[PDB]
Design an enzyme around this catalytic site. Sequence first.
Site, mmCIF file in Angstrom:
data_model
loop_
_atom_site.group_PDB
_atom_site.id
_atom_site.type_symbol
_atom_site.label_atom_id
_atom_site.label_comp_id
_atom_site.label_asym_id
_atom_site.label_seq_id
_atom_site.Cartn_x
_atom_site.Cartn_y
_atom_site.Cartn_z
ATOM 1 N N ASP A 264 0.814 -1.216 0.000
ATOM 2 C CA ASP A 264 0.000 0.000 0.000
ATOM 3 C C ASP A 264 0.851 1.271 0.000
ATOM 4 O OD1 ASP A 264 -2.527 -1.342 -0.004
ATOM 5 O OD2 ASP A 264 -2.400 -1.716 2.097
ATOM 6 N N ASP B 204 -3.329 13.738 22.096
ATOM 7 C CA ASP B 204 -2.104 13.527 21.318
ATOM 8 C C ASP B 204 -2.221 14.081 19.918
ATOM 9 O OD1 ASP B 204 -0.894 12.334 23.405
ATOM 10 O OD2 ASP B 204 -0.738 10.360 22.602
ATOM 11 N N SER C 72 -11.768 4.984 2.102
ATOM 12 C CA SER C 72 -10.834 3.879 1.925
ATOM 13 C C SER C 72 -9.714 3.897 2.982
ATOM 14 C CB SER C 72 -10.297 3.777 0.499
ATOM 15 O OG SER C 72 -9.538 4.916 0.166
ATOM 16 N N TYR D 286 -5.121 3.909 9.560
ATOM 17 C CA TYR D 286 -4.861 4.625 10.837
ATOM 18 C C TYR D 286 -6.174 4.871 11.623
ATOM 19 C CZ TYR D 286 -1.741 7.731 13.654
ATOM 20 O OH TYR D 286 -0.967 8.294 14.644
ATOM 21 N N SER E 115 -7.231 1.846 13.755
ATOM 22 C CA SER E 115 -6.362 1.747 14.913
ATOM 23 C C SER E 115 -6.799 2.692 16.020
ATOM 24 C CB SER E 115 -4.948 2.094 14.488
ATOM 25 O OG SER E 115 -4.470 1.181 13.528
HETATM 26 N N1 LIG Z 1 -1.204 3.137 14.157
HETATM 27 C C1 LIG Z 1 -1.461 3.175 12.855
HETATM 28 O O1 LIG Z 1 -2.557 2.531 12.265
HETATM 29 C C2 LIG Z 1 -0.573 3.917 11.902
HETATM 30 C C3 LIG Z 1 0.420 4.800 12.323
HETATM 31 C C4 LIG Z 1 1.066 5.561 11.350
HETATM 32 C C5 LIG Z 1 0.707 5.427 10.001
HETATM 33 N N2 LIG Z 1 -0.277 4.544 9.606
HETATM 34 C C6 LIG Z 1 -0.685 4.348 8.182
HETATM 35 O O2 LIG Z 1 0.418 4.201 7.279
HETATM 36 C C7 LIG Z 1 0.058 4.766 6.027
HETATM 37 C C8 LIG Z 1 1.222 5.177 5.134
HETATM 38 O O3 LIG Z 1 2.420 4.644 5.627
HETATM 39 P P1 LIG Z 1 3.356 3.710 4.714
HETATM 40 O O4 LIG Z 1 2.498 2.759 3.970
HETATM 41 O O5 LIG Z 1 4.266 4.598 3.959
HETATM 42 O O6 LIG Z 1 4.184 2.894 5.842
HETATM 43 P P2 LIG Z 1 3.532 2.335 7.220
HETATM 44 O O7 LIG Z 1 4.318 1.174 7.686
HETATM 45 O O8 LIG Z 1 3.502 3.366 8.286
HETATM 46 O O9 LIG Z 1 2.037 1.837 6.835
HETATM 47 C C9 LIG Z 1 1.867 0.717 5.997
HETATM 48 C C10 LIG Z 1 0.932 -0.324 6.603
HETATM 49 O O10 LIG Z 1 -0.400 0.157 6.622
HETATM 50 C C11 LIG Z 1 -1.206 -0.586 5.720
HETATM 51 N N3 LIG Z 1 -2.185 0.245 4.992
HETATM 52 C C12 LIG Z 1 -1.968 1.331 4.180
HETATM 53 N N4 LIG Z 1 -3.164 1.756 3.713
HETATM 54 C C13 LIG Z 1 -4.148 0.969 4.215
HETATM 55 C C14 LIG Z 1 -5.541 0.934 4.077
HETATM 56 N N5 LIG Z 1 -6.211 1.918 3.505
HETATM 57 N N6 LIG Z 1 -6.265 -0.029 4.749
HETATM 58 C C15 LIG Z 1 -5.629 -0.966 5.538
HETATM 59 N N7 LIG Z 1 -4.260 -0.933 5.669
HETATM 60 C C16 LIG Z 1 -3.535 0.016 5.028
HETATM 61 C C17 LIG Z 1 -0.232 -1.292 4.775
HETATM 62 O O11 LIG Z 1 -0.719 -2.484 4.180
HETATM 63 C C18 LIG Z 1 0.936 -1.550 5.706
HETATM 64 O O12 LIG Z 1 0.713 -2.717 6.467
HETATM 65 C C19 LIG Z 1 -0.776 5.969 6.397
HETATM 66 O O13 LIG Z 1 -1.636 6.303 5.337
HETATM 67 C C20 LIG Z 1 -1.508 5.514 7.656
HETATM 68 O O14 LIG Z 1 -2.805 5.087 7.322
HETATM 69 C C21 LIG Z 1 -0.907 3.801 10.551
HETATM 70 N N1 LIG Z 2 -3.244 12.300 25.971
HETATM 71 C C1 LIG Z 2 -2.776 12.391 27.210
HETATM 72 O O1 LIG Z 2 -3.479 11.943 28.336
HETATM 73 C C2 LIG Z 2 -1.437 13.001 27.499
HETATM 74 C C3 LIG Z 2 -0.504 13.287 26.504
HETATM 75 C C4 LIG Z 2 0.768 13.690 26.905
HETATM 76 C C5 LIG Z 2 1.075 13.792 28.270
HETATM 77 N N2 LIG Z 2 0.134 13.507 29.238
HETATM 78 C C6 LIG Z 2 0.402 13.618 30.704
HETATM 79 O O2 LIG Z 2 1.060 14.834 31.083
HETATM 80 C C7 LIG Z 2 1.908 14.566 32.188
HETATM 81 C C8 LIG Z 2 3.049 15.554 32.395
HETATM 82 O O3 LIG Z 2 2.850 16.692 31.604
HETATM 83 P P1 LIG Z 2 2.794 18.161 32.254
HETATM 84 O O4 LIG Z 2 1.987 18.101 33.495
HETATM 85 O O5 LIG Z 2 4.182 18.667 32.324
HETATM 86 O O6 LIG Z 2 1.962 18.974 31.128
HETATM 87 P P2 LIG Z 2 0.689 18.365 30.324
HETATM 88 O O7 LIG Z 2 -0.176 19.478 29.881
HETATM 89 O O8 LIG Z 2 1.100 17.565 29.144
HETATM 90 O O9 LIG Z 2 -0.125 17.461 31.397
HETATM 91 C C9 LIG Z 2 -0.779 18.082 32.481
HETATM 92 C C10 LIG Z 2 -2.241 17.667 32.590
HETATM 93 O O10 LIG Z 2 -2.344 16.315 32.998
HETATM 94 C C11 LIG Z 2 -2.895 16.234 34.304
HETATM 95 N N3 LIG Z 2 -2.270 15.189 35.138
HETATM 96 C C12 LIG Z 2 -0.952 15.034 35.492
HETATM 97 N N4 LIG Z 2 -0.852 13.944 36.287
HETATM 98 C C13 LIG Z 2 -2.079 13.388 36.443
HETATM 99 C C14 LIG Z 2 -2.571 12.280 37.143
HETATM 100 N N5 LIG Z 2 -1.767 11.378 37.675
HETATM 101 N N6 LIG Z 2 -3.918 11.986 37.088
HETATM 102 C C15 LIG Z 2 -4.784 12.783 36.368
HETATM 103 N N7 LIG Z 2 -4.300 13.875 35.685
HETATM 104 C C16 LIG Z 2 -2.978 14.169 35.715
HETATM 105 C C17 LIG Z 2 -2.734 17.629 34.911
HETATM 106 O O11 LIG Z 2 -3.665 17.961 35.929
HETATM 107 C C18 LIG Z 2 -2.895 18.499 33.680
HETATM 108 O O12 LIG Z 2 -4.261 18.701 33.392
HETATM 109 C C19 LIG Z 2 2.449 13.184 31.906
HETATM 110 O O13 LIG Z 2 2.840 12.566 33.106
HETATM 111 C C20 LIG Z 2 1.282 12.487 31.213
HETATM 112 O O14 LIG Z 2 0.580 11.701 32.144
HETATM 113 C C21 LIG Z 2 -1.106 13.115 28.851
#
Ligand SMILES: NC(=O)c1ccc[n+]([C@@H]2O[C@H](COP(=O)([O-])OP(=O)(O)OC[C@H]3O[C@@H](n4cnc5c(N)ncnc54)[C@H](O)[C@@H]3O)[C@@H](O)[C@H]2O)c1
Ligand SMILES: NC(=O)c1ccc[n+]([C@@H]2O[C@H](COP(=O)([O-])OP(=O)(O)OC[C@H]3O[C@@H](n4cnc5c(N)ncnc54)[C@H](O)[C@@H]3O)[C@@H](O)[C@H]2O)c1
EC number: 2.7.1.23
Lengths: 255, 255, 255, 255
Positions: B45, B142, B150, B155, B158
């Site tokens: 792909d 994040d 398609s 991604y 996932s």
């Molecule tokens: N956690 C995740 O699912 C993740 C993370 C990053 C990127 N990606 C995917 O990777 C794609 C491109 O990366 P790359 O191919 O250059 O290397 P890559 O290794 O990051 O992704 C390739 C993998 O994804 C699969 N894939 C691609 N398109 C697909 C589709 N529409 N349906 C099901 N599987 C599919 C391929 O068969 C292969 O296994 C991005 O378009 C994204 O969708 C997925």
């Molecule tokens: N998607 C996510 O949940 C995400 C992404 C990245 C980082 N983080 C968290 O951020 C923390 C540290 O980053 P930072 O504080 O410097 O800035 P930050 O903004 O990335 O995270 C701070 C936020 O997370 C909360 N937090 C921290 N510890 C916690 C706990 N144990 N339970 C519930 N909430 C909590 C805080 O109250 C604040 O709202 C990391 O330890 C990680 O846990 C979370």
Amino acid sequence: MKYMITSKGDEKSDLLRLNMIAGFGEYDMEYDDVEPEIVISIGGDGTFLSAFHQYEERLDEIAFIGIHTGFYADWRPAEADKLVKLLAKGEYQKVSYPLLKTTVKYEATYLALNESTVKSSGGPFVVDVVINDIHFERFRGDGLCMSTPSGTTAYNKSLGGALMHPSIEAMQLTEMASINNRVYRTIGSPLVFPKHHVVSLQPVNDKDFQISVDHLSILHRDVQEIRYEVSAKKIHFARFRSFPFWRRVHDSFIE
Amino acid sequence: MKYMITSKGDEKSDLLRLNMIAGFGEYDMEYDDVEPEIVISIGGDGTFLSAFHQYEERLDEIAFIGIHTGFYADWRPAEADKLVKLLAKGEYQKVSYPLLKTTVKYEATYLALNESTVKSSGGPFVVDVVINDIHFERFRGDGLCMSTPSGTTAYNKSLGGALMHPSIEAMQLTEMASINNRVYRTIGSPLVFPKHHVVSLQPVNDKDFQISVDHLSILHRDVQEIRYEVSAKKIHFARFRSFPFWRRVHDSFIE
Amino acid sequence: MKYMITSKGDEKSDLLRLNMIAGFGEYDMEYDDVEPEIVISIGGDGTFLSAFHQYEERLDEIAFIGIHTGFYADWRPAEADKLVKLLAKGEYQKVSYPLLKTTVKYEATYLALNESTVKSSGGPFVVDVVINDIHFERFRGDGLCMSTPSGTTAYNKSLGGALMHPSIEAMQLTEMASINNRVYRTIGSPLVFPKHHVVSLQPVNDKDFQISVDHLSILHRDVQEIRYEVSAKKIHFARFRSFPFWRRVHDSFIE
Amino acid sequence: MKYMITSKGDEKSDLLRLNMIAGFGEYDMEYDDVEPEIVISIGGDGTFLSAFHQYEERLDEIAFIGIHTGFYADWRPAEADKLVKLLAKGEYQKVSYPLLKTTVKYEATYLALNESTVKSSGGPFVVDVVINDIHFERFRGDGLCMSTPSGTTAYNKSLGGALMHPSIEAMQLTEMASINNRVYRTIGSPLVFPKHHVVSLQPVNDKDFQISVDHLSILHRDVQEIRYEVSAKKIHFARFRSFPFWRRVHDSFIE
Ligand SMILES: NC(=O)c1ccc[n+]([C@@H]2O[C@H](COP(=O)([O-])OP(=O)(O)OC[C@H]3O[C@@H](n4cnc5c(N)ncnc54)[C@H](O)[C@@H]3O)[C@@H](O)[C@H]2O)c1
Ligand SMILES: NC(=O)c1ccc[n+]([C@@H]2O[C@H](COP(=O)([O-])OP(=O)(O)OC[C@H]3O[C@@H](n4cnc5c(N)ncnc54)[C@H](O)[C@@H]3O)[C@@H](O)[C@H]2O)c1
Ligand SMILES: NC(=O)c1ccc[n+]([C@@H]2O[C@H](COP(=O)([O-])OP(=O)(O)OC[C@H]3O[C@@H](n4cnc5c(N)ncnc54)[C@H](O)[C@@H]3O)[C@@H](O)[C@H]2O)c1
Ligand SMILES: NC(=O)c1ccc[n+]([C@@H]2O[C@H](COP(=O)([O-])OP(=O)(O)OC[C@H]3O[C@@H](n4cnc5c(N)ncnc54)[C@H](O)[C@@H]3O)[C@@H](O)[C@H]2O)c1
């Protein structure tokens, strides 16, 4: 024009219905719960669902409005007099949402505004999922949910489903507690089907199922097939002002 | 007719490409990688995605075929001679899948066949999600992923997204590790948008974002807006035989 | 020593049980299904669960072994003669897994090796979740599941629960299709409780519940409280060779 | 006794710190940020995390208190004078939470109070997950998170992890966007490991990883192994009054 008003049956809803009836009396504007062109539901989404199922044979003739004492409303009680007046003048446009057709063969057909679900009679639940005649998966788990676009905010959501805008003519299948191991496999993701795709559920063991259609839940015995398709019929709402679906979603789920 | 063949670059793919070129030589059937009407990708792909992005300016002129040495294929190596022959006779119909338009304003525009994602430059990620000018949520987490139909198997899947049939002209937004507590709130569900709905991401702090479009990932600085819409352009595939999307899904995920 | 053998009841399992009985006859090694020190289950996890519930009053006296014709086994049919011999020599050590106590007040007490779940009698399900006397949430949804560590691979897993190593004396609560909106709120995450933490479910409407304990499912009427705690009692397994829990998990779920 | 106070650095936090310092001056109660027995953090959880990492070499000598201007607090600004007084009298007991040890081999060792995560350097992320020397899975996806029990409410939660009571000496592994299809397989569930279980991550391609430990995020090059274990060291909190973990969870997530 002809209209009727359903009520939740508590003191607030009945009194609000009586006052609206009196307000409509000042125009005219006949009350008719046999063949209405406008159905007003005062209560919650349950009341609205009951209203829809009460008139599911005249869907192409009716526009629905909901007052929330509430996803399918629309209106707050304090705005009810404004509604009476706007409805009276006919200052409104019509919006259509797609519906789901459920067919159960042993044929019984049901229309859902929200969803149709399937569980066992208790009962390990195991069915073969067939999509346009192709065997897609054997589902093992607690059950399955097939939702319309406006149902996506309801039971669908709780099951990890996507919210779909109701301008999309589709239905969405979600899993309830699917079993996945080395031997048993499901897709483990919701599936969104276009109009004219048919999803069929076929029994493996076990031919008795508890089938829901919105609020209605009945045990079906000796089932050969459960068939899902986006219906040709639509529900019509009266509107009135801009209240976009995504705004409605924001208001119900964010703040 | 004019054609070209891209290859993954390993020994199997190159050799298979050379043999196909020779097979096409027996017909005619000019090889042209500047202005081809048919683009054959041999690899995975990734190769197919590179092929699509290589010719994204001539999408309305090209039909794509994929050979899998593999979601976007289509063909196994051992069937390649059959393909040469069918392609030669023109014994095929065209299927169109919808694409996603990404606009980045500081305007840069990108087309995605799979998805476009946004993450911080590292970086707590915080954006306001605006849908058709209405402020829907402030997303903290994040990142976000916007997928074509398609792309829903990639991604999107996932991340807990629904699989959508590509006859549906839509895009689907999924969350990456959203933060939800008493203060911070997201919808916590994938969202499916129709054509002509616009989703805009607006910076809160922090105007630097890592933006992906399929395989391409670049850091963007001083961003004012990221805008998503279903594209007016489509990708065309050549087919050849029935290979339904749901069968393709079954084969890739079930068995 | 005293032993008994339960069987799934198909032709393979019964014949394998008879052959083992004859093998044990060569040692001695009395068969006694009233007061055994060793309980052998031949079948699947259902058979093993039935075996456990058959002797739940003599848990501190029994070591369990499972033969898989299968998460709680342990042994394949072709290894059965090796088992007879090792069991005969007493060449084994004992491993203990924690169990869950369920108390239902109107008191009925149940022991679960896998999980205890609660759903309505059908029935919107709404309960208050109280943890060590503190009101934690009002749960609205399809139901709740409380799992032991060895149950985490079963119904718990299907509901999005974590897999816990059974050396951890804990219980884990998972949600079934919880409703979350602007008004209704649950934690939306599994919860892991140590020994001596008490989780109580209290009715809001609706005092009739369908309560499961492993395979057993019974409707309970006029319930005041459902109380969960890690039990003081443990299940003992006989082992024999290294078969680590994480290896067992790998074998059942990965390959 | 010796104490210090860290501050978030905004006007509210600094002023509150100065007033507390003056309050402590009335007792005695020496301020010492080199070798304190009590560390007070005024700000958010970020401030508290910085405080913990500032004194991670004297964990067995320090008790921590947090003021929230906030999961790890404890105290509101308006209660600060009560705190000064209670701290002065020594009217408090000590509570210990478990920590996570991260070892990176090319050895660098880190302590986490919340979590340690791994992502690629950008970068498809692929690692082999080895548990007590047994090869458990090959993980493909965005990354992995290993959380302490008090970290379970943070990044862990966002990734679908269980909340664990911190009286449980454990660590919990969650997936970030794992890829699962016919070829690639992960467990697709969080995993809870007891003390003395070792989880090792081993590179497949690709030996460069972005490794986080709470707030700290650094790119590591030429990695042979990332090793997780529950630490022998604990964090101590001063308390003061009953504020149960589940109440703390309720307050942060429910209302
Ligand atoms: N956690 C995740 O699912 C993740 C993370 C990053 C990127 N990606 C995917 O990777 C794609 C491109 O990366 P790359 O191919 O250059 O290397 P890559 O290794 O990051 O992704 C390739 C993998 O994804 C699969 N894939 C691609 N398109 C697909 C589709 N529409 N349906 C099901 N599987 C599919 C391929 O068969 C292969 O296994 C991005 O378009 C994204 O969708 C997925
Ligand atoms: N998607 C996510 O949940 C995400 C992404 C990245 C980082 N983080 C968290 O951020 C923390 C540290 O980053 P930072 O504080 O410097 O800035 P930050 O903004 O990335 O995270 C701070 C936020 O997370 C909360 N937090 C921290 N510890 C916690 C706990 N144990 N339970 C519930 N909430 C909590 C805080 O109250 C604040 O709202 C990391 O330890 C990680 O846990 C979370
Ligand atoms: N776990 C769950 O999400 C769950 C379980 C069973 C039933 N249901 C829903 O209940 C509905 C009918 O039951 P009832 O109303 O007679 O009593 P009910 O209590 O079972 O459901 C009513 C609740 O669901 C909400 N609701 C209904 N339609 C909705 C929509 N489309 N979007 C968002 N919320 C919606 C209502 O506002 C109300 O809060 C069914 O159509 C089904 O969607 C949900
Ligand atoms: N959606 C679901 O996951 C679901 C629904 C209902 C019941 N159950 C499970 O079924 C069990 C008892 O039912 P039954 O065996 O009489 O018939 P059953 O068909 O309902 O369940 C048996 C299946 O669950 C597996 N199983 C049992 N214990 C397990 C364990 N601890 N780890 C992994 N897999 C396990 C068995 O190998 C078998 O495949 C209950 O304890 C419950 O865990 C699961």
